[PDB]
Amino acid sequence: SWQTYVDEHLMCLAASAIVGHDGSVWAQSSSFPQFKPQEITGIMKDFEEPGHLAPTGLHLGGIKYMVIQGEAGAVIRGKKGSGGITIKKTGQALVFGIYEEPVTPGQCNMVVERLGDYLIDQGL
């Protein structure tokens, strides 16, 4: 099934998703939150303007994260409690990874990187 394909190729407590720059879901794991378009817009702006989201924090699914060091124009990183969020920009899409202990930041960061690696390799 599509969902078993997605769940085993994405990060699946942790969740992950591939979202177009226009905000449409290309694939999301079973527990990935619904999000708001304005949330995607501010994320797209932080990729243009590093530090943009830092004074207000990063919001996804209404959840507030503290912005930390990412990769300018390419990766956003956020922390909350014992978990956090990683967002990688590709040519056409955004890869999201959300994690909570005992999932580690490094586990999430690497699933996101691998997804972006695949998408960019496909020209997306």
Author numbering: 2 to 13, 22 to 133
Sentences from the paper on this structure:
In this study, we present crystal structures of Bet v 2 in the reduced (without disulfide bridge) and the oxidized (with disulfide bridge) states at a resolution of 2.0 and 1.7 Å respectively. The reduced and oxidized structures were determined at a high resolution of 2.0 Å and 1.7 Å, respectively. Both structures share a central six-stranded antiparallel β-sheet with two N- and the C-terminal α-helices flanking the sheet at one side and a third helix flanking the sheet on the opposite side.
While the overall structure was conserved between these two forms, the crystal structures revealed marked differences near the N- and C-terminal segments, which are linked by the disulfide bridge Cys13-Cys117. By contrast, in the reduced form the helix is more relaxed and extends beyond Cys117, which is rotated by approximately 30° between the oxidized and reduced structures. Moreover, the N-terminal segment harboring Cys13 was moved away from the helix for approximately 13 Å and is partially disordered. To test the secondary structure content, we pursued CD and FTIR spectroscopy. Both methods revealed a slight increase of helical content in the reduced Bet v 2 form as compared to the oxidized form. This can be explained by the exposed cysteine 13 in the reduced Bet v 2 crystal structure.
